[PDB]
Scaffold this active site. Structure first.
Site, PDB file in Angstrom:
ATOM      1  N   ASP A 139       1.203  -0.802  -0.256  1.00 32.22           N
ATOM      2  CA  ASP A 139       0.108   0.294  -0.191  1.00 32.22           C
ATOM      3  C   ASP A 139       0.684   1.172  -0.144  1.00 32.22           C
ATOM      4  O   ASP A 139       2.348   0.763   0.180  1.00 32.22           O
ATOM      5  CB  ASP A 139      -1.140  -0.341   1.253  1.00 32.22           C
ATOM      6  CG  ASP A 139      -2.309   0.676   1.096  1.00 32.22           C
ATOM      7  OD1 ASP A 139      -2.302   1.185  -0.391  1.00 32.22           O
ATOM      8  OD2 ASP A 139      -2.926   0.691   1.975  1.00 32.22           O
ATOM      9  N   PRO A 174      -0.745   2.720  -8.627  1.00 33.57           N
ATOM     10  CA  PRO A 174      -1.311   3.308  -9.684  1.00 33.57           C
ATOM     11  C   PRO A 174      -2.621   4.146  -8.620  1.00 33.57           C
ATOM     12  O   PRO A 174      -3.053   5.246  -9.312  1.00 33.57           O
ATOM     13  CB  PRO A 174      -2.286   2.711 -10.310  1.00 33.57           C
ATOM     14  CG  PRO A 174      -1.873   1.179 -10.106  1.00 33.57           C
ATOM     15  CD  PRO A 174      -1.492   1.216  -9.239  1.00 33.57           C
ATOM     16  N   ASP A 200     -11.960   2.077  -1.995  1.00 35.89           N
ATOM     17  CA  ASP A 200     -11.334   0.594  -1.689  1.00 35.89           C
ATOM     18  C   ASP A 200     -12.862   0.602  -1.699  1.00 35.89           C
ATOM     19  O   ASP A 200     -13.803   0.248  -1.508  1.00 35.89           O
ATOM     20  CB  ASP A 200     -11.759   0.843   0.194  1.00 35.89           C
ATOM     21  CG  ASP A 200      -9.545   1.068   0.281  1.00 35.89           C
ATOM     22  OD1 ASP A 200      -9.032   0.614  -0.955  1.00 35.89           O
ATOM     23  OD2 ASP A 200      -9.620   1.674   1.339  1.00 35.89           O
TER      24      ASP A 200
HETATM   25  O1  LIG Z   1      -5.504   0.142   5.925  1.00 35.80           O
HETATM   26  C1  LIG Z   1      -5.490  -1.318   5.154  1.00 35.80           C
HETATM   27  C2  LIG Z   1      -6.583  -0.706   3.813  1.00 35.80           C
HETATM   28  O2  LIG Z   1      -5.475   0.026   3.242  1.00 35.80           O
HETATM   29  C3  LIG Z   1      -5.261   0.758   1.921  1.00 35.80           C
HETATM   30  O3  LIG Z   1      -6.498   2.107   2.040  1.00 35.80           O
HETATM   31  C4  LIG Z   1      -5.399  -0.200   0.831  1.00 35.80           C
HETATM   32  O4  LIG Z   1      -6.272   0.157  -0.560  1.00 35.80           O
HETATM   33  C5  LIG Z   1      -6.854  -1.417   1.687  1.00 35.80           C
HETATM   34  O5  LIG Z   1      -7.574  -2.132   0.981  1.00 35.80           O
HETATM   35  C6  LIG Z   1      -6.329  -2.101   2.624  1.00 35.80           C
HETATM   36  O6  LIG Z   1      -5.226  -2.576   2.692  1.00 35.80           O
END
Ligand SMILES: OC[C@H]1O[C@H](O)[C@H](O)[C@@H](O)[C@H]1O
Ligand SMILES: *[C@@H]1O[C@H](CO)[C@@H](O[C@@H]2O[C@H](CO)[C@@H](O[C@H]3O[C@H](CO)[C@@H](O)[C@H](O)[C@@H]3O)[C@H](O)[C@H]2NC(C)=O)[C@H](O)[C@H]1NC(C)=O
Ligand SMILES: *[C@@H]1O[C@H](CO)[C@@H](O[C@@H]2O[C@H](CO)[C@@H](O)[C@H](O)[C@H]2NC(C)=O)[C@H](O)[C@H]1NC(C)=O
Ligand SMILES: *[C@@H]1O[C@H](CO)[C@@H](O[C@@H]2O[C@H](CO)[C@@H](O)[C@H](O)[C@H]2NC(C)=O)[C@H](O)[C@H]1NC(C)=O
Ligand SMILES: *[C@@H]1O[C@H](CO)[C@@H](O[C@@H]2O[C@H](CO)[C@@H](O)[C@H](O)[C@H]2NC(C)=O)[C@H](O)[C@H]1NC(C)=O
Ligand SMILES: CC(=O)N[C@@H]1[C@@H](O)[C@H](O)[C@@H](CO)O[C@H]1O
Ligand SMILES: *[C@@H]1O[C@H](CO)[C@@H](O)[C@H](O)[C@H]1NC(C)=O
Ligand SMILES: OC[C@H]1O[C@H](O)[C@@H](O)[C@@H](O)[C@@H]1O
Ligand SMILES: OC[C@H]1O[C@H](O)[C@@H](O)[C@@H](O)[C@@H]1O
Ligand SMILES: OC[C@H]1O[C@H](O)[C@H](O)[C@@H](O)[C@H]1O
Lengths: 391, 390
Positions: A139, A174, A200
């Site tokens: 991430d 990306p 997400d």
């Molecule tokens: O904190 C964990 C959270 O952080 C990011 O936003 C990712 O995009 C998510 O899918 C998840 O991994």
């Protein structure tokens, strides 16, 4: 990424959408992020058919780490929630014949605020290798600049390769480039087995639509960079949870198959309905997702609250998905020229069409000149396999 | 409306949300708006236990009318899709122990564009009663002014009384008044058995949420006026269709009970899951909706992506609904002091709480000093009944 891995989209389970950053093991033991959560999911992946259906990678998402580094500079598992370390969990997961995914962040902190990997790439990739980690989700939170973002995503790729170990590398690069500027997907394919493009997922029909429309809109820039070794990642499967209707669950399964999406279930395998399960373990729909040609499908037609998507498969075969985006009324009639599907190639001189979704049904032979008439449930998708045939 | 009717919220089935205005009987004969569709649903209401459960009114929404009136000025049913006329359908629905509803518009046309009742209120009411109609849903499209809207909803209400036939009077008056002025609910109640307040429901969780949110927002205006004879109408039940998860269906069933809402299913009785049938026919939950005291529940509390709603009931009982509005994660913990429920009096000195939704389960006794704790599913609701020990 040319590490020999993800020759088909990775398949497994990830804690995030269903378990999030639940740290409270006292009042919420059954849903806190703990080693015993992972051990129990691992046992069910085996005894409930999951690993047989091709779900292989049990993955830890954010909130497994102790508040900071050890006195050697290395990451560590939470001492209370993961008292046995990552290495013992990896043995456990490997003993079941499954693979283990972990999480880290390219910046100064993870998204939930735990130790980041900036200034620590080499040390961490190695640490992950000595633990027996088999996938890394990477991430991009708390990152100075794009320069550091790219440098760090590229660094970790090399660090992991440089460990000796086969470790599937999953980037949100990306997503975080988006946008200071449009991502260069060729640079990313070079570094990543798959990549998060968009926001997400959560447990809603809203979220699903928005990802489809995002991809749909942006398909001319993303569909052709996907193939064996590097996939577009529209985020987790959320079938088995609470927010989707049966029909919206078939929409998510059908289209993640069309999209050649990795399939990370995020759900609770201890509490899943028999129909969620049959859907998730659908052998014919997984075969589509896992088709060895590995060309990503696309949106063919949009209009009148309908969409037609289609994916090219090996052996001159095609998957076709029809979506009803009208959220009032009932099942809506949709008809199309069989010659319009699969670039006129499926169904020349004929194809045998079988409906896979919402139910499995042999539909007849269809000649090149034939029409397919179907009916699609509000928010539902109809999923078809066209087999090219001498006829 | 003091017509002796709707002493508890009306229950039945209404075609619009699921069948809409489908005039295509040649290509979709089983789903077009035809006398057949009504006959099928009428026998299923009897044979599948709907009527035992209290679903009584089988109701025709828009798109039934022939395109013009008869030589004597009367509405007529469409001759191809309704060859036998509305009276004979009424005869038929009556034969099964059911009651028939029909649909008209206060203005110049019905929302789909078919003959309105403006200029015809007296003849239309009489025509309806002559046919054996037991309920009129009266819509407010194609109406000039707020004057004519009020004049026509009042006029029709009085034409109906004068037939001498009992006819539930369902009104879309308030909906068409917003965003011109605040409706006078005390007035509406005087003329209407129930009234639509907000935008047409969808087969969607977005729609349900927005009805819930609208009601809880305007609850100071609407809650107290509801009661035997006169109900707020949050629109049709859509459970059994395509767009709601199990947990969203429970939310709609629970909340329509708390709100003392008419229960009009809009669904395909020919094709409905067993789980969706047991929800819609949940005896204990229908008993909440149907509580003879008829006091509308309201929202108690909203915070940290949870809501608590409660309704007062006959015999010192209360119903409490706890909704999880967070759309991510798993079941989430909600706790509240029982002293805070039921105005402080449900559960003083104690109460027995029994959970009804998502599953029936006796929870035990709670002293006045106790806290109720539940885990509530994303987009789900927990529905409890509380009996004061006395
Ligand atoms: O904190 C964990 C959270 O952080 C990011 O936003 C990712 O995009 C998510 O899918 C998840 O991994
Ligand atoms: C036309 O309007 C009349 C009043 O606006 C309405 O009369 C009302 O009819 C009901 C019939 O159920 C009466 O109620 C019952 O009420 C008595 C006394 O209130 C109770 O003790 C019992 O429960 C009994 O069953 C109302 O009392 C009565 N109100 C008035 C003011 O007379 C007519 O029914 C209407 N006519 C039609 C056909 O719609
Ligand atoms: C480290 O990177 C190299 C460079 O890509 C990887 O080697 C490739 O591996 C596949 C495996 O089948 C071969 O088809 C390619 O020919 C290899 N590339 C080269 C340069 O020959 C190597 O596998 C990586 N090692 C790890 C541990 O990921
Ligand atoms: C992580 O932390 C350090 C400290 O804040 C950051 O390094 C600084 O970055 C600035 C901005 O470019 C440099 O000019 C300074 O030399 C650094 N300052 C210090 C105090 O060391 C770094 O950028 C952060 N890393 C990420 C990935 O955001
Ligand atoms: C996006 O990035 C890729 C790879 O980082 C670029 O392709 C490389 O460009 C160099 C220099 O021009 C070539 O010599 C290489 O052959 C390319 N490498 C690969 C892996 O293809 C690509 O051109 C970039 N696109 C843009 C617009 O910058
Ligand atoms: C909105 C409006 O102006 N209404 C007109 C009114 O002026 C006219 O007198 C009436 C008689 O037919 O027809 C209509
Ligand atoms: C119907 O239309 C006529 C003629 O244009 C007009 O007199 C009248 O105001 C209309 N009725 C309503 C309630 O809008
Ligand atoms: O020649 C290098 C060789 O590496 C190994 C295989 O993956 C082949 O695909 C490739 O040709
Ligand atoms: O890429 C196809 C081919 O690559 C190389 C080898 O590892 C083969 O076994 C594999 O099938
Ligand atoms: O056309 C009929 C349609 O008309 C309006 O939109 C009403 O508010 C709906 O419930 C329905 O009756």
């Amino acid at each position: 990424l040319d590490n020999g891995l993800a020759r088909t989209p990775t398949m497994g389970w990830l804690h995030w959408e269903r378990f999030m950053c639940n740290l409270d093991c006292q009042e919420e033991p059954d849903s806190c992020i703990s080693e015993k959560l992972f051990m129990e999911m691992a046992e069910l992946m085996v005894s409930e058919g999951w690993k047989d259906a091709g779900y292989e990678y049990l993955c830890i998402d954010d909130c497994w780490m102790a508040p900071q580094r050890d006195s050697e500079g290395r990451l560590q598992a939470d001492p209370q929630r993961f008292p046995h370390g990552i290495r013992q969990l990896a043995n456990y997961v490997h003993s079941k014949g499954l693979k283990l995914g972990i999480y880290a962040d390219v910046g100064n902190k993870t998204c939930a605020g735990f130790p980041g990997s900036f200034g620590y790439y080499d040390i961490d990739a190695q640490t992950f290798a000595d633990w027996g980690v088999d996938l890394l989700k990477f991430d991009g939170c708390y990152c100075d600049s794009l320069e550091n973002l790219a440098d760090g995503y590229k660094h970790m790729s090399l660090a992991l390769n440089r460990t000796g170990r086969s470790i599937v590398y999953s980037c949100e690069w990306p997503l975080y480039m988006w946008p200071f500027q449009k991502p260069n997907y060729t640079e990313i394919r070079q570094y990543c087995n798959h990549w998060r493009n968009f926001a997400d997922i959560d447990d809603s029909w809203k979220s699903i639509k928005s990802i489809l429309d995002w991809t749909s809109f942006n398909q001319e820039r993303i569909v052709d960079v996907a193939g064996p070794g590097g996939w577009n990642d529209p985020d987790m499967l959320v079938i088995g949870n609470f927010g989707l209707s049966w029909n919206q669950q078939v929409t998510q399964m059908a289209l993640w198959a069309i999209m050649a999406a990795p399939l990370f279930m995020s759900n609770d395998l201890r509490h899943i309905s028999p129909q969620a399960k049959a859907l998730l373990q659908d052998k014919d729909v997984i075969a589509i997702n896992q088709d060895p040609l590995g060309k990503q499908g696309y949106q063919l037609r949009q209009g009148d609250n309908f969409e037609v998507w289609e994916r090219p498969l090996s052996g001159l075969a095609w998957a076709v998905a029809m979506i009803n985006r009208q959220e009032i009324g009932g099942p809506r009639s949709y008809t199309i020229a069989v010659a319009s599907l699969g670039k006129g190639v499926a169904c020349n001189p004929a194809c045998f069409i079988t409906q896979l979704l919402p139910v499995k049904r042999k539909l007849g032979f269809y000649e090149w000149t034939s029409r397919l008439r179907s009916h699609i449930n509000p928010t539902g998708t109809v999923l078809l396999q066209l087999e090219n045939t001498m006829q």
